[model samples]
Target: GSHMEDFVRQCFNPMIVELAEKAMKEYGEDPKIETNKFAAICTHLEVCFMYSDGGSKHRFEIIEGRDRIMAWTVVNSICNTTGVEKPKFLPDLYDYKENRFIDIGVTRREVHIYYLEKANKIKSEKTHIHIFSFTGEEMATKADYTLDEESRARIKTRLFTIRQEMASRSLWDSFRQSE
Candidate 1:
């Protein structure tokens, strides 16, 4: 039943921590952003997990803490590629004149706002931005995905059978990874 949680702890959490640490290290170099030379970004990063029993009922959590460094990679990459200026929201990193650095520990919801703001800039339209938060239950869990092993195997088998049947019958010309 806890295979998912085990998998997350053994696999996903480590990957997230690794990538986030790398991001913090490499991106921390900008002169505009401040960092503690003694502190490791991983020290500030905490992993949280949420699990549902594959039912209609939904459970959720709110994570409140330092920004995840991984978010900086995506936001920085997009801004660099598209020529969109970063938002000047962080006084520590950015002057009123420019949007420069995203401080560590920014949430996904917060980073997403920049994308929306960019979209509006392209369209020359003003839009309302909504910020969301996680729940205490979600934030409290350390690590574990509590999905049943039997059910997961069953679903994988059914999905594989469906994929094979579709390919044999040519339901779609091709299955692309994206879209």
Candidate 2:
């Protein structure tokens, strides 16, 4: 296609229109999906979602792998638009299953790590999660924490859950599977 608009109209629009009709017939289209780039990309990726045109589906599949890199470039472009430096903080290596950007900046949290060994004496009432993806040293003061064991245990357990979740997500699985 010469331009994005041309591709959208001549190729994508008609295809999605037919797909919408089929979905409506099957599921009664209450929420008529518009141009969701995520759905579009997924459709391109051929992750088993139905599509309007077989030709388009196959074409998209052929292009989808490379398209992820393009999408990450778009992510960096967005960061550039928003006047953010270090646009490539996150590379395109991750699966295009999600957005290709880090959390905006740092956040601070006050934790009573009374259980994590030798944390009682230190004046670490607060700590920062200095997000290294951006230009400025964006910092936030730690949140309040009660100096008690029960609350500290709860927060530590919550952090353990968070780590478990992150592990479950398989952040680098694409690279592993690629081999």
Candidate 3:
């Protein structure tokens, strides 16, 4: 599409709208979903979540594997679509999924990392997972942990459960609001 409005209307808006309708029908229009520890990963190009109070922020290394790179590739794919200029942070897709955009002066080899910390940590009772990505830096104090295997398994299991629950409560079609 020529304009963003048109492009989004065709590509993005319908995408979300159809998902909404399908979800409503499938979910009996029930809005309340059983929250999971699998939190939102908002890896945007520039903007990021703010830091405030109690939050468990962790830095993870994008390791050596197809799966690890999935997160990185997915972020770039969604963000770089449409007629917009290619993102400066993420490069044009190359090496298939191998992530070899180590072009100096334009891209950095650390993949991506975290910095914008200000707000989303104050819930005290919530898992503040609203983060972008991570940077590799050894800290004095480290709650450092290996991700990938643990995280992948954790998220995978939760996803299965979520799908199960969503299907379990499936209800309603159009014009019918579910609880």
Q: Rank by TM-score, descending? A: 1, 3, 2
1 versus 2: better TM-score goes to = 1
* TM-score to true structure, per model: 0.21, 0.19, 0.21
Clashing pairs in 3: 28-178, 50-118, 50-119, 51-117, 51-118, 51-119, 52-118, 52-119, 113-134, 113-135
How much is 72 displaced in model 3, in angstroms?
17
Note the residue pairs that clash in candidate 2.
Answer: none
Runs of candidate 2 with Cα error greater than 4 angstroms are 1-71, 91-156, 162-179
For candidate 1, the 10 contiguous residues with the lowest summed lDDT are: 132-141
lDDT of 2 by residue, 51-80 (tens): 112222222112123334565576556547
- Whole-model lDDT, model 3: 0.25
lDDT of every model, 2 decimals: 0.31, 0.29, 0.25
The better candidate by lDDT, 2 or 3, is: 2
What is the C-alpha lDDT profile of model 1 across 38-110, one tens digit per residue? 1122222332211112322432111212254444454455457646564433211211122222222212233
